[PDB]
Amino acid sequence: GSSGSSGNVDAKIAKLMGEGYAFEEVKRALEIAQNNVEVARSILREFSGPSSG
Amino acid sequence: GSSGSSGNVDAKIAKLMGEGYAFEEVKRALEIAQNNVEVARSILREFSGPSSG
């Protein structure tokens, strides 16, 4: 992506919440992930594990 | 740090292992962290979260 050294936090939370996760879980993921969306998606994947099919 | 665009993976695994975590745990943490030591620490703090004092 165009920038990889911080920027915003709330926009990232909104991003991950759109994947179908609760705000609380997302806030946890962005905290741990040093506020990175690309990285937070892996955290929520582990803590939730969504289905498909 | 000075540079964060991915890089060698072994050099990251071998770093977190020196903290006190097992290979299994470290390799996992790095994969979740998009192979980044700085974020892997926060992940190991969630799967282990060791004590001090």
Swiss-Prot record, chains A, B:
Expressed in placenta, heart, lung, kidney, spleen, ovary and testis, as well as fetal brain and liver and hematopoietic cell lines, but not in adult brain, liver, pancreas, salivary gland, or skeletal muscle. Present in lymphocytes (at protein level). Induction: By serum starvation. Changing A14E: Loss of ubiquitin binding. Reduced levels of tyrosine phosphorylation. Residues 8-47 form the UBA domain. It is found in: Cytoplasm. Phosphorylated on tyrosine and serine residues upon TCR or BCR activation, and upon various types of cell stimulation. Auto-ubiquitinated upon EGF-mediated cell activation or upon T-cell costimulation by CD28; which promotes proteasomal degradation. Coiled coil: none annotated. E3 ubiquitin-protein ligase which accepts ubiquitin from specific E2 ubiquitin-conjugating enzymes, and transfers it to substrates, generally promoting their degradation by the proteasome. Negatively regulates TCR (T-cell receptor), BCR (B-cell receptor) and FCER1 (high affinity immunoglobulin epsilon receptor) signal transduction pathways. In naive T-cells, inhibits VAV1 activation upon TCR engagement and imposes a requirement for CD28 costimulation for proliferation and IL-2 production. It is linked to Autoimmune disease, multisystem, infantile-onset, 3: An autosomal recessive disorder characterized by autoimmune manifestations apparent in the first months or years of life. Clinical features may include hypothyroidism, type 1 diabetes mellitus, systemic inflammatory manifestations such as fever and hepatomegaly, and autoimmune cytopenias. This protein has one functional calcium-binding site. Interacts with SH3 domain-containing proteins LCK, CRK and SORBS1. Interacts with LCP2 and ZAP70. Interacts with CBL. Interacts with SH3 domain-containing proteins VAV1, FYN, FGR, PLCG1, GRB2, CRKL, PIK3R1 and SH3KBP1/CIN85. Identified in heterotrimeric complexes with SH3KBP1/CIN85, CD2AP and ARHGEF7, where one CBLB peptide binds two copies of the other protein. Interacts with poly-ubiquitinated proteins. Dimerization is required for the binding of poly-ubiquitin, but not for the binding of mono-ubiquitin. Interacts with EGFR (phosphorylated). Interacts with IFT20. The N-terminus is composed of the phosphotyrosine binding (PTB) domain, a short linker region and the RING-type zinc finger. The PTB domain, which is also called TKB (tyrosine kinase binding) domain, is composed of three different subdomains: a four-helix bundle (4H), a calcium-binding EF hand and a divergent SH2 domain. The RING-type zinc finger domain mediates binding to an E2 ubiquitin-conjugating enzyme. This is E3 ubiquitin-protein ligase CBL-B. It comes from Homo sapiens.
